[PDB]
């Protein structure tokens, strides 16, 4: 039945034509699921922090009899919590301490240890801990490190079709990229020449790398080429014949198979003769002599008597050699096949181009080629070649490369070494040659099986390993020099490089960026994005075009909808709602198991490759009562191409209809009724939904809005939900029941709300409570509602009554007409808490003290300041006024009489300081919420900090008091329960506890003992609380750690408030965007017989050109919901009976097909029905799935239910003339979302400001006063007009010329309106820059 | 790079700025700069008035 | 590069300088001590390399910085490339009088006006207001005028209105391919923070009213104002400089209004009667006649220019409708009556304005254009066109056509499995069959979305043109086309998205019903390809324009 | 610093009409070279033209 009593207030009418089997996951366990293994203690050193130590920590000195052993590590407790780290401005990290061991061995004795120093733990830097949901705290901010998509390490075979020489050929190449080390490639030439290009170097020669591995010429010839048979005795030339290999088009002559000739000379080839020759036993048959000239020798042969160098390897045989190989005695000279069809001579064709033939002369050529400046000395030629990609310390693949290597070569074993071997390259080249010949298929680049996502879990590990391998060198160099000496373990292990690397990775990187706090959806979308940019993958952003495209394997692993429309389109992707990371790093997707025609409730997570082997059905297929199919031929996918199959060949089936949809694109109603472009742009604009004052519920509904809101990590939940006792605007206490609590605790939980706290985009983060007083709350229920939330669900915008009609050309193309009743009703009003801050910057001449009595300033302007010089919180600071007075101590002079006289005249002003306070930026206004102040510990100041100090302390004082308060009662209660029938009265003990009157003859036995026992406990508690808060005080007044010069800062938080205006840009979920055009009064708006004028007017010209029937359906559903809500409101206002209301609600809920059941009067106690009806009296919310929403018939039925025209259109009147429109116009309440780009945040103009020192040009960006670049596209427009004079006045006079702009200003102020060209400064700068070289240039006459 | 060293005013250029706007003749403008350039930034002028007459060269 | 104060962090331009300086100093100091030949040779080689890298660090230099591996800025890279001195000395420098405000719409303006916010003013025409206050005596000095402007009193707004009375201004948009991207306008003060814009000139700037940032430049000198008034003024360039055709032609809303106000019916309210001609407007605001009343006789005065361009009047009592009769008053005298007695689509008013500019002149053409825009906005507001779920209807024979097509595909695949048809032949035959089915569905859609509105009469059936909003906004030419409407009722088609490969089974759904997940997923590839192509073609077009302009 | 980059005695002075020395710090002396430090007191604008 129904549950979640908190959600049971406003029940959403979901349709759900398809049932649900798999519950929606946490939807935000990717960053935290991968970062957890980085700190969790693993039983074996496989992954995480153990894999960073067990890998390269046990380093050994250079024969110094020293060893470094690792026992275990531990992470200390953080100094501050998540709250204080963002307030103060310090990072949130935990200290790392590890116990090491220094094993020293005595010389001249094997395995002889004298002592060990494994009794001290060393601290190696602080690792940045992770917050409750995926986020991190760095320098008071909140950053996110997006996971990066990388091709899995392994062997890849590219094609490069029609891009070699424009001749129509292809060069099948091969590449092998490891996880850490150097690369290796095998390129192919149109002239059948192989390359050994390494690390994108020059084109290397033929396969000499195999010759450098002790493999001689004959070994490679026997390996890559096979010798079938050869025999010659007394000029017989008899050889065995194989039908599969020795074939071709025709035969020259002399073809007899044991007597009777099967294939005559000069006859066509027949398969029947080949079959008859293969069936019958055929021995070695005679062959002509002309075939000897064509075939090439395989191995090296020499004469028996003479041992000269005749008959070398890789040399075609000739007739002149025949005699000289006939008398030598070589009867068996093995040869090659040399078949252009299958077994090509490509290997032999490249061996003849090798400059060297011996391994020694071969291994020295690659050394001078990889390194430009290096002489062959027989010293590094072997070591560098062995340490390049054959050493463990310089080459590794983390077993992922090994798995992909074993999988691409049809190997069964999955375990191997990180380094490469000879047989590995042998098999790689063999498969490459086979693919070139036509054995095998070309691998796919953009296939997801080859791609994998890397989160912080396997990136912070790499960063820590890189930071530790640097200190490893210092440890090695220190253990060698001065080893025989007793020292501390922390002798040379300084965690400077490790800390620097961790800081460079987390703080400022290419993947670590500020999160989008515009809305709860923005952050949950940004945490689930996937990018291909960063330190790896492709080369740059201008990489290719076929990579940034959708693939058939992108069905249920990424989102093809959510993607930007900028220069990085396609590269950015979004994870699906059911996507999940694999153990190796791949992407998996769930599917139900379908056996013997029935569907089993069990699910399996298939990967990208495994999905290609089975047959996967669709979620939109009908299902019988017994799990059977209605239609025999169901649409299913087999190998990418979907088609109809029988009910017996189906293997798997999808889970839901939103499996191909992400977390943000699933919040679009009627997605299938929208174009792929409009839905895309609507989901993109949905990320930037700016919140408002009161979030309005999405009456239309799209699905798991409650789930998205509760998983976005923006609201507060109630863990161990019991009973609520005290509610407040910033504090909520909850008394947990006896069942859901453990002993040793008071049994209360406290939640401190977050009220008006800044975000990464100056968006206020406010929270609101939900329970009033003494309401039972279950576990996991939402207690507090944050920004853009309403009763636990997500609400990005507001419901608004729209009407698609032209209105005096104000909605001409895409402008949205807005009534005046929308500004009056405080709708779409946003708060903006921007906050600047003035430093101290203590000099060396004096300490500029922030005072409250500066010079050159009236008393009226200093009437807003404090006694210590700091703007009172609550003041309505506007324009440009003093915010934080601060005078810099200027170096005072000496005697100079005038000063002496002047000084006496006034005092403490003349020759004292140089006024320079904060001053609110020219263009900022609004009340100042609160001011924070950080001071360097040890400085005798704390003027206004004391006030703040008390406040903070006070809050904590009561915070831990309540818990203790309750404890006290129990103690007395126990004493009062122990004093029962012990000669004690009621009022006597009530008047004053006093430890039960010091056990005044309660029982004269255990009574006193109990009392004593209780006394101790009571006293213990007192001391406990004392020290409990004792530490708290210390931390609060522990001081702040700033920089060097800075003395004491004081950040002030301003707080504006904007209503809407004709320059604001709003949009919807469907993609229909636009700016306002006019704010017309209420009366001008259209209306009808009843009234209620529309608030928003839209343009219907977009619907035909842009397929957005989804918004029409949304409008109709909103109209029906509002009609039902108005009927309910009327029934509540007429004070009707509860039975009629309950019947009406049940009838409005139970309408539709057998898709969902919901009935009242079975769980509600006649009191929750009125509560439910009060929450939706302004309209009840609906819910329609992504690809399983309501149908037109159901919408028309819901419209007819609400006592209104079934069509949806209605005859509207005119609010200006007063007549009626002949054509009916569609009305309803749709959902609108406010955007971030406004007009009061970008509009700026100027005429004269400050210009740069270079070429004397103004600024371009939004500085105090900046201009706009006048590009070439603008002057090209002017040259075709005749604006030569305008161009002349815009190029020099008002841009570059220094005296020119001043003279122009003078002439305009005087009223002359003339121009003097002169000469710009940019040309002079150019001449000065050209004269800096050996080039002469000067102006002549 | 960063050769955008924004410039400023402060009673030397600002003082000179006003000079142009007002109607001062060639002989007067010339003289104006002499006295507007002897104005110490701290507060008042440096040299005496008679100095200024001698540094006109008349 | 003045930093916080701790380290200056110079612009890495004097670093090469100090390197060369100290290298030459140590070389000259070593030369005086008679060093060995090898040492002095290596030192002079290092000096040569340092001097060669100082001029340019892009030839065997590979210079790095102290912070990261960034190339050191030489004296040759700051004079070339995209960012450099030759792109800061040419038209690449920022200019004052910026603008930068969101563009909105305005139906009360004319062809040579623009809504300028009062807040954007008082900062642009600042030296002008200063001079005005100085001449009016209300400003004794310059500091006084500056103080009065800073306080923003009542008098400075009147002074600004007086100054900006007849001072031309010019507008510019960031993407400006053709010369029409920069025009001039007469600024008009409007309360607000957004810049209004004429609906007809919008097509000139190629905007869609999703307002981006704009630019507003102010001519200071007299000759610049003269050039902006005589050459850059919008009332001077009406035709396109590429083909000599008018571009100020009305847009969707005006087209829709003019098409709705010009439409004949069968049995209207009070048809048949004879009208004077200027009386049709009276019965429009009352109930004695409909705008769509056909078979109505009303005389009109047609002026011709036969005798040496002299206006000769002629009356013939032509039969027309109430709407066309009312529109005729807007039509000037120098035009015949056979230009408005029609359907009046998009091309109709275009060629009407073309003929008007050809015959009657520029000023009367501009007058006719603004009046046409006014009356089109008015009739489009009075009409009340809306799009609903009932405004589109799926053909009833569509399911039968789909069943026949799938039966034909089944027969084709059966013949293929029998061994008579190969793979490629069967594939092409299935493609052709699906194309024929799509064509037949598209043809049957027009049977219901066109001339399918029967009205009761003496014959009970007349089969006049339909009055569906989807069809009236399409056929007129306002917005959309028949191919886009086809996807609304019929089938989308084959949609060969992946690498152009056609799929055997095409999408048989429409944007009104509920599409399948797989069909939407397949269709998504085409949009991803299209968006990428549109994002990529812009750079190529810009490079082509740059090269062509630089060459010619 | 003396005889270096941005130094005195070349590239114009660091101020309007005064050398780094500290004499002739006014318009009274315009085209004379100070004996203490040989820095011209011509103008500050001349620094970008030397």
Residue numbers in the entry:
A (entry chain C): 1 to 1341
B (entry chain M): 110 to 167
C (entry chain D): 253 to 804
D (entry chain D): 52 to 101
What does the paper say about this structure?
In bacteria, RNAP relies on dissociable sigma factors (σ) to recognize specific promoters and are thus the primary transcription factors. In contrast, σ54 recognizes conserved promoter sequences at −24 and −12 (13–16) and forms stable RPcs that are then fully dependent on specialized activator proteins for transcription. The activation of RPc requires activators that bind to DNA remotely upstream (−100 to −150 bp) of RPc and use adenosine triphosphate (ATP) hydrolysis to remodel RPc. σ54 controls a diverse range of stress response genes, forms a major variant sigma class of its own, and has wide importance for various bacteria. In this study, using both fully duplexed DNA and −12/−11 mismatch DNA, we formed transcription complexes, using the AAA+ domain of phage shock protein F (PspF1–275), an exemplar bEBP shown to be active in vitro without its cognate DNA binding domain, ATP hydrolysis transition state analog ADP.AlFx, the RNAP, σ54, and a native fully duplexed nifH promoter DNA between −35 and +28.
Structural models were obtained on the basis of RPc1 and RPc2 reconstructions, while the reconstructions from RPi were insufficient to build detailed models. The structures are similar except in their relative orientations to RNAP and the degrees of distortions of DNA around −11, suggesting the existence of a range of conformations in RPc with varying DNA orientations. Notably, promoter DNA consensus sequences interact extensively with σ54, via ELH-HTH and the RpoN domain as well as RI. The flipped-out base of T−12 of the T-strand is stabilized by interactions with S335 of σ54 RIII-ELH. In the RPc structure, we could observe density for σ54 RI-H1 (residues 15 to 28) with P17 N-capping the RI-H1, causing a sharp turn away from RNAP and into the DNA double helix. M15 was observed near the −11 melted base. This raises the possibility that σ54 RI N-terminal peptide (residues 1 to 14), although unable to be resolved, probably due to flexibility, could have threaded through the DNA to the opposite side of the DNA from RNAP. Here, we show in σ54-dependent transcription that the nucleation of transcription bubble occurs in RPc, due to the interactions between DNA and σ54, although activator binding further promotes/stabilizes the −12/−11 DNA distortion. This DNA melting nucleation event involves base flipping and subsequent capture by σ54 residues (tip of RI-H1) at −12 position. Unlike the σ70-dependent RPc that converts to RPo readily, the initial −12/−11 DNA opening and the following RPc engagement with the activator in the σ54 system are insufficient for RPo formation.
